[PDB]
Every structure is written in C-alpha cells, then in structure tokens.
Amino acid sequence: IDYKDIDTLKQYITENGKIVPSRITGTKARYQRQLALAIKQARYLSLIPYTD
Amino acid sequence: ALTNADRAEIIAKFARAENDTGSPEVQVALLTAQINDLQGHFKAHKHDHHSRRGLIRMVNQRRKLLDYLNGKDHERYTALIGALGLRR
Amino acid sequence: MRHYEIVLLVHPDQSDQVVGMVERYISQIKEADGQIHRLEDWGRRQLAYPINKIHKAHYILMNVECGQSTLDELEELFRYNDAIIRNLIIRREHAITEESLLAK
Amino acid sequence: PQVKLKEGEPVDVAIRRFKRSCEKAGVLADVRKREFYEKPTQERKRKKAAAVKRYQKKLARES
Amino acid sequence: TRTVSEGVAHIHASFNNTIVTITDRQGNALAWATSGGQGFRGSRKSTPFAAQVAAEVAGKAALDYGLKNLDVLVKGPGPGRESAVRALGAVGYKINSITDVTPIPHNGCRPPKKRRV
RNA sequence: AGUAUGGGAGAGGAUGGUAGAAUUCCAGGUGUAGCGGUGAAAUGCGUAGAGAUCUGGAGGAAUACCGAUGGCGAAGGCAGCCAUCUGGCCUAAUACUGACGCUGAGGUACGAAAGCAUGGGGAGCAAACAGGAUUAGAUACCCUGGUAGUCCAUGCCGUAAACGAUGUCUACUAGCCGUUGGGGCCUUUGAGGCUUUAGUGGCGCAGCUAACGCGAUAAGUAGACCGCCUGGGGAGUACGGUC
Numbered sequence A: 001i002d003y004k005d006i007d008t009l010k011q012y013i014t015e016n017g018k019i020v021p022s023r024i025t026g027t028k029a030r031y032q033r034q035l036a037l038a039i040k041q042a043r044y045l046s047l048i049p050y051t052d
Numbered sequence B: 001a002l003t004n005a006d007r008a009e010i011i012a013k014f015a016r017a018e019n020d021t022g023s024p025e026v027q028v029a030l031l032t033a034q035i036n037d038l039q040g041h042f043k044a045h046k047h048d049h050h051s052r053r054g055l056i057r058m059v060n061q062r063r064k065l066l067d068y069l070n071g072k073d074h075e076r077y078t079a080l081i082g083a084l085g086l087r088r
Numbered sequence C: 001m002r003h004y005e006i007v008l009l010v011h012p013d014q015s016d017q018v019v020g021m022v023e024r025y026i027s028q029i030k031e032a033d034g035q036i037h038r039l040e041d042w043g044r045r046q047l048a049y050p051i052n053k054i055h056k057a058h059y060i061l062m063n064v065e066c067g068q069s070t071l072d073e074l075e076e077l078f079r080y081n082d083a084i085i086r087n088l089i090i091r092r093e094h095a096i097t098e099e100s101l102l103a104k
Numbered sequence D: 001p002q003v004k005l006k007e008g009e010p011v012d013v014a015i016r017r018f019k020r021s022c023e024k025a026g027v028l029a030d031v032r033k034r035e036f037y038e039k040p041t042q043e044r045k046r047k048k049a050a051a052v053k054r055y056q057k058k059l060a061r062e063s
Numbered sequence E: 001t002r003t004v005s006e007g008v009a010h011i012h013a014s015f016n017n018t019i020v021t022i023t024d025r026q027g028n029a030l031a032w033a034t035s036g037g038q039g040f041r042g043s044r045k046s047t048p049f050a051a052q053v054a055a056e057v058a059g060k061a062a063l064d065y066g067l068k069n070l071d072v073l074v075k076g077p078g079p080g081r082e083s084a085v086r087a088l089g090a091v092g093y094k095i096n097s098i099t100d101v102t103p104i105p106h107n108g109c110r111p112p113k114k115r116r117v
Numbered sequence F: 001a002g003u004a005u006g007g008g009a010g011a012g013g014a015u016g017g018u019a020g021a022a023u024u025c026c027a028g029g030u031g032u033a034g035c036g037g038u039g040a041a042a043u044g045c046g047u048a049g050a051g052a053u054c055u056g057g058a059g060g061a062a063u064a065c066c067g068a069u070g071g072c073g074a075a076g077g078c079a080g081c082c083a084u085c086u087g088g089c090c091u092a093a094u095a096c097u098g099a100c101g102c103u104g105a106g107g108u109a110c111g112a113a114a115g116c117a118u119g120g121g122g123a124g125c126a127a128a129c130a131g132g133a134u135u136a137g138a139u140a141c142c143c144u145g146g147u148a149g150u151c152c153a154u155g156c157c158g159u160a161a162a163c164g165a166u167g168u169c170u171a172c173u174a175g176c177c178g179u180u181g182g183g184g185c186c187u188u189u190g191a192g193g194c195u196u197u198a199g200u201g202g203c204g205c206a207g208c209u210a211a212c213g214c215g216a217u218a219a220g221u222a223g224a225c226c227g228c229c230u231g232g233g234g235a236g237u238a239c240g241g242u243c
C-alpha cells in the first residue's frame, strides 16, 4: 500500500484521526506496518490531518 | 562499498581453477578488499562500534584463513601475502 | 544511479510560475544525466491543516533517476526556493511509470 | 467528538450521546495516564501483566 | 451594550475547580463564573452542584448581551463537565454542539513525580 | 566450518535535515474578582488586572495513536518522518574450498544510571536547599518554590537484583495449542488448508529435583573446554600492589 491511496488510508483512521489497531481491523502485521508508514507520510504531506 | 563488478574482478584475479570461489586465496582477497574499503567509513564515523564489530570479525576470519593456508602450503601463503601487501 | 520520488508543495501565488521551475529542474537532471520517468501535476488542492497560514497548495510529483551530486543540488534548490513550502524525497526501487491514483 | 445537535434532541440525550463518544475516544484515560510520570520499569511490568491477562482471557473464551 | 447572536461556552473542568467562560465567536469574553465565585471554598469547589451553580450564573449574565445558540467546548477531567452543560440547557440556550478539547501531548514534557500518599 | 550469486524482514549503528501535538515564557485583544493547592488547609499568584479565552512570537526536550508473551542487537540497549554512510540475520538451488573446528588461563574491546573534566545549552522535571503543613518531635512522607543534574560536543569512570539470580558448543529423547520472518505443496481464484525451517510463548508423557519446580528455548540423556563454592560473623574490610 502506498501513501497516495487516501481512499484506503481513511478506512483505518478513527474520527479524530488516530490509527485503528490490527486487533480491530483484522489486518495482518506486515500490512499494518506498511499502513502506518503510509499514514504518517500522508500526514506529513498534508493529505490527511494529524488530528481531527 | 564494493560492487558486484569489483568482487568479480577480484575473484577472477585470484581464482585457482574455474568457478573457484571458496579457495583461501579468493576468500582472503575479498576480505582484504572489504577491510581496506571500510577504513574510509570508520574515519568519518569514529563512534560506530556496532559496525566496527563486523570489521573485527572480518579481520579474525582473514587471520584464521591465512594461518590455515600457511599450514597447508608455505609457497602459496608467501605468494598471497606478497600479492596483497600484508605484513603477516 | 538510484531512483527517487519527489513531491513538491508550491505556494498558490506561484501557480503560474510552477511550470518554469519544473522544466528548470528537469533540465538540470538531464544535464547531469538521469531520466525523468514520471511527471504529474495534481493542481491546486486544499490542505488538511494550514501551513504558514496557507490553506491551498499546488502539488507536483516527479519520478527521477539521478546520481548523488544532482540529488544534493536539487535538495539545495528546494531548500532555498521560497515558492516551495514542503517537499518529500523518497528513495525507490525499480522505476514507476503508471498513472497515479491521485492525479486522475 | 463534534456532537452536533438535531432539533429533536434534548439536552439530556445530547449529554448522554457526547459522553458515549468521549468513552469511545478515551481522552480521560489519556489525561489520567499523563497526570504523573511512570518509570520504564513499571511501564514494562504493567504491559507484561496485561499481556498475561489477555492470553488467559483468550484461552478462557476458547474453552 | 454590544449584541451578538451566536456564542461559545468554554468549561475548564478540573479536579479542584470548574470555570465557565461564555464568549462570542472568535473568542472575546462576555461572562465568566467559577465555583469559588459562588462559594464552596476549598475542597467543595469540585462538586457537580457547584459546577451547575457557576454555569447558571454565567448563562444568566450572558443573557443580558442576549444569545440564543451556543457551542460548548469542555476541557479537562473532573466533576461538573456534564453538570455545567445540564445547567446551561436548563437556563435555555440552544446547544449547537458539544465537543471535547482536552489537550494531549505526543510525548512532550515530563510529568511531575508520583505522589507516595 | 566457510565463500560467490538471487530474494526478504527488522526501534541494529553513525551523521545531517525536517514535521505535528503539548508544557513554559513574552507582546497584544475581549474581560473581571478570584486562581492555585490538599485528607482539610496554609505557604504562593491576583485590581500594578490574575485565572479563563483568542491571536502572534521565543526556546528546549520528548515522539500520542500504530504498539503486540511484536521486532532488532554479544550484552548494555534501540521507537515520529526523510536522505547519506554502515554491521549482522533469515531464505532457495547450484557451484566452490576441503576439518580451515570448539573452548579459552593471561590479554583486549564494548559496557544502564549516577558521578568527574573542558566548552555550550536549559522548556519540563528535580538530589541539595527555603518556606507551609502534619506530628509528642518531622530533621520524612503531603504542598508551594527551586540549584546541581537530566540535554549537546570531546574525554574519563567500569559499577547494577548488569537476572533466565541458569557459561559457551554439540548430538539424542512423547505429544497438543498460539505467534513473528521465510521455503514448498494442495485446492481454486482468493482466500483458505497441509508440511518444513529459524525465532518467540502457553501446557504437558518419560526423565530429573530436598521441595518448589524444569520438561526439544531442560534444571533430561551424554561429550569438550572454561569460571566459581567449601559453616555464620569479622569482610569484598585491613596491609601491600595495579588502575
């Protein structure tokens, strides 16, 4: 998963902007790590908010 | 860092037969090249102890291979250390 | 030569001037050597949070291949150009040429 | 949160809904966590105990 | 003297005290009341009843400017964050939204040491 | 035991840059009697305009969520993001060398926190210290402040319940259930199900143990080498020596 796919990125973000754990999403661990990296990159690039 | 071309050139220079990669001459030549290359890195990063451990391991492995080669054949050992410019 | 992906955020006031800068950087990369593998303009987009009291930005994506020195020169240019407010440089394996999701 | 109010909703349902959203978010737990400094030793001990409890709960609900 | 229609109510709720500040939009204060301002000095400043009294006093004070609708922002833990909203609704403003704005560090400064009570 | 070539996972290490949240201080706007703190208070701050709220600056330190009997490292330890330099590990099949191995007295390298030296930095926290409480007393626990230090550069010190209170290497000895990184196979289309390998956990047959317990990650069955113990105090002390 790449940081540009904000449509998939928002699926794993709570309302206030936090990352949703794999405990809830059922995501596999490697995918979860890639997803967290993509979310942080998008936050830096201002495609998605850090909070709210 | 050395590239595949550099390593292949060293292997071709020091090989003792066709497809020979495990001979003491080839192994010691590769180790010497790597050890000499890393000296530039440890000049800039004096406090990279975690990486310096690997260099110490390379030095120890080279010493063991040299001692084995000297035990097996003194002429090949002399020729190899002369070619590589090593004190011992 | 290594492969790099560059994302540039340019001030909306320089939305017209973005074109000159892009050809400038492309020409510099080509003079060094290199190959531009992908170039995309995402246009003007709304920021998720204000940057320097600005709510809009012009987005540029480049996929380039270059040596070390040219990467340093590009980094210096991005640092000292006031039009660019944010940049992201990511080293990549292979080369990417497909149409991005965000460009549309 | 940002619990906007419908015209039909009274203040009491507003408060209950906003309280539920705050429980979902968990801000108050964060505030109580950062009220005082917790040392790394105690933090690791607490997390290890939590892991043991989680595994035992999983085993109990499995059988 | 000044007239505004929309408002905001900031409820600073804390384990020791609750402060209600009714402000216009863009945050210029219009009315404010705390528990100590109505009494309950010392340990009693933190009760929901004191929070409610402070909230009603602030709302009645702001009615002189005259506001119909307000957004409520709550900050902090502690008793009275719900009670104050209850009192404002009882006074009769219409609450547009209620959002929690308690600040959270992303591992910023080091907290004080633990109390050995 | 080692080498060459393809592929893979990682808070492994060093250098530089950068991002957002929060605390503190400063300057303005609106605004007016309290705020703060506790078991309860008082010290303290406030009409010289505090606290609360909005805006704009300065600076330092640390990286919420992800996050996990998860991962990496010889151990000590390692957590935002990006680039540069760099170590080791896993995995497949060929090819290559041909015992090149294991352990290791002396020796040498690394080695948490506190501490020391020279020069910077200093938000928050906080030994010492000052005041307020509690107390028969309080030299403490609690509260209000607060210097060294915590931070950076370059060196020293060499100690911790530095712990798995369990030295390193090798082979063998029922099974069942998880989890991380890979390989292969099978259905059949997207996801599952079998095996194997290197880690990391929970039970448990045999065996072992004074017992507790350990039980393929042994404290079982054996082999190689090293370190250490010989009743409790005196005492890791005195003297001599090295640093």
Ligand SMILES: NCCC[C@H](N)CC(=O)NCCC[C@H](N)CC(=O)NCCC[C@H](N)CC(=O)N[C@@H]1[C@H](O)[C@@H](OC(N)=O)[C@@H](CO)O[C@H]1NC1=N[C@@H]2C(=O)NC[C@@H](O)[C@H]2N1
Residues within 6 Å of the ligand: F164, F217
């Ligand atoms: N090959 C290389 C691999 C290296 C790696 N290291 C893996 C490894 O090799 N491990 C070896 C296993 C040794 C084992 N650790 C010894 C042990 O477990 N107890 C020591 C003897 C104590 C006594 N005989 C039994 C006991 O009192 N038990 C308690 C008890 O059951 C329960 O406590 C309470 N309150 O009832 C539980 C939860 O609190 O804690 C246990 N106690 C503990 N649990 C902890 C734990 O596992 N570790 C660290 C430490 O914290 C441990 N103490």
